[PDB]
């Protein structure tokens, strides 16, 4: 939960690029 990952969403996936 920091780098470029691909979580399962909308019954598929999606790229993330959020940070804390």
């Amino acid at each position: 939960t920091t780098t470029t990952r691909y979580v399962e969403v909308x019954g598929k996936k999606i790229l993330q690029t959020t940070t804390t």
Side-chain angles (χ1 to χ4, degrees):
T1 179
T2 172
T3 55
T4 286
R5 62 162 217 203
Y6 263 114
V7 84
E8 66 209 290
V9 329
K12 269 212 242 160
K13 53 148 138 125
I14 216 130
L15 196 69
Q16 255 272 273
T17 188
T18 294
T19 57
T20 53

